[PDB]
Symmetry: C3
Subunit: 242 residues, 3 copies
């Protein structure tokens, strides 16, 4: 069974916005890692730069292109050096619609994405799969609507398991309250993308997690995070329960 | 000796320097145990009130959410704790550079403040002030700080004729606040230091820091 | 041997628009980076890096207030001596200068100074004495060295292909020699303590407090240079 989903290149107004909330100043923020160490600062991408490029070149300017070639890292090994060599033209993260995200592998080597969307699209379990994107391939890795639906659902699901454990253990004088933020470290996960350049991880590979690959990045989508937060704030408040 | 001060909720001059107002009145740095997580959050002077909660909106400005942040080194222990940060708290800046904390979290907040140290009559830095939910305590008085950094630098300087000689790295601490969410530290707790707690934040007060710079250029250490 | 060098007090290359910042400075304590990367606006041609505490940012980086849970007594002793630190000035399109204001000299790592001193690239330490005001980076010289270096990289690679089963295609890496190149655009200086043979600190990252300075304009020029390299085309 393919834990590794392959993604080869495939050459070619009626519905309101998801939220009235105004767009963010940045549509996403990107943190680059070498193994379990973050190299360089977090790169923010203005919502006015619908396409950001992350290659292995050296221009520091910022804005819509985030270079990794010039970054230093005192702990860097000879392996990370080998890998960093092949990043090259890297990838393009394109933001369409309110907050949909696409990836364009411009590198000569395949990139390995970690996306909850792609997981669902492959009939796989959440987080159980590595999506390999072949050089030149151009595929959608995140759908705002799909994510939003999932959030409200998961959020509800949790809120219930809240009153569940609540009525569970629940004599003297004692009060109960839902953990101010149940299932949050999980809903946020739905708003974060990740991708490893050159090297892939998982069963078929020596790297077991992405934290074990020479050079990857973690993409935080803000418009998704805006929604989610807005969702968390539409839940019954933790009112002490005798 | 009552190392832990208790702050339950109890319902209710001109500028010190001509020096210009800070771009940001403070900057917060969130840590998990002894690792800094996220970027350092900087609060504009036009945002006299900042909220640090456990939610997930990444926007800048007056709200710093620790919920969406990641940490490869994160542990179950830390996660379980982050679970209760909730409404978090509100750090407020009054006057030229005074600071007040307002706990909104359902659970206590343990602040490390020199100002409170004096009020509680404890030896400087030998106390952990526990802010109870809904409490609206004042944690930093600019004027006092100013009075203190001067004297402390004056004595640290005069102590050159010789320990008593403090360097920048001791005076700067007068301009910094620190607080832990949910968990507390001290002798009555497993965590002996703040950097040994699941989630806390170090707060740098910029107005106070300026005064200190202005002071290290008159009473050189 | 002369690994340690002593420096006591004694037209546009591109149309590409001037960088937003002319350099990015990162502060380190041993092998740890304390504080955030300070970015200097091009409008602040001279930035000051001292050991004081104004957080104001802009044209002055203070390492005084910065915190580090890993800090030690040795690093604390060392920070004590940074004082007025240094001044990094930017002349022209991208030339960098250093003026030691500290009472203690500092030790820069400058590929340009290496060229001048007639020493193997990167194999030297330049000690800037208090009061000294010496040039440490030259764009023109840097630009010229880049191209010839990138070019040598290329040749070497293609010469690696010939050095090699017919039914298979071979190909050269995209980032060939890209590291050593970008290094030509970065400066490093250690306050108070030097490093090298004559020192108990064998490398910059073994010193209590140093900074790495990324020269922006130079980095752009190298980007263009890199984008003028023959696209990698797998030959069978």
């Amino acid at each position: 069974n393919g834990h590794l989903q392959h993604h080869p290149p495939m050459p070619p107004a009626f519905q309101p916005p998801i939220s009235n909330h105004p767009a963010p100043e940045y549509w996403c923020s990107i943190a680059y890692f070498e193994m379990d160490v973050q190299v360089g600062e977090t790169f923010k991408v203005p919502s006015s730069c619908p396409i950001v490029t992350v290659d292995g070149y050296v221009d520091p300017s910022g804005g819509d292109r985030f270079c990794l070639g010039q970054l230093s890292n005192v702990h860097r090994t000879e392996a990370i050096e080998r890998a960093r060599l092949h990043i090259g033209k890297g990838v393009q993260l394109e933001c369409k619609g309110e907050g949909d995200v696409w990836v364009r592998c411009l590198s000569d080597h395949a990139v390995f994405v970690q996306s909850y969307y792609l997981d669902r699209e492959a009939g796989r379990a959440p987080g159980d799969a590595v999506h390999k994107i072949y050089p030149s391939a151009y595929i959608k890795v995140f759908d705002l609507r799909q994510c939003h639906r999932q959030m409200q659902q998961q959020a509800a699901t949790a809120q219930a398991a809240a009153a569940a454990q609540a009525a569970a253990v629940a004599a003297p004088a004692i009060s109960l309250s839902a953990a101010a933020g149940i299932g949050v470290d999980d809903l946020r996960r739905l708003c974060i993308l990740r991708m490893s350049f050159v090297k892939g991880w998982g069963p078929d590979y020596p790297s077991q997690s992405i934290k074990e690959t020479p050079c990857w990045i973690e993409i935080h989508l803000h418009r998704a995070l805006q929604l989610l937060d807005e969702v968390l704030h539409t839940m019954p408040i933790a009112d002490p329960q005798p």
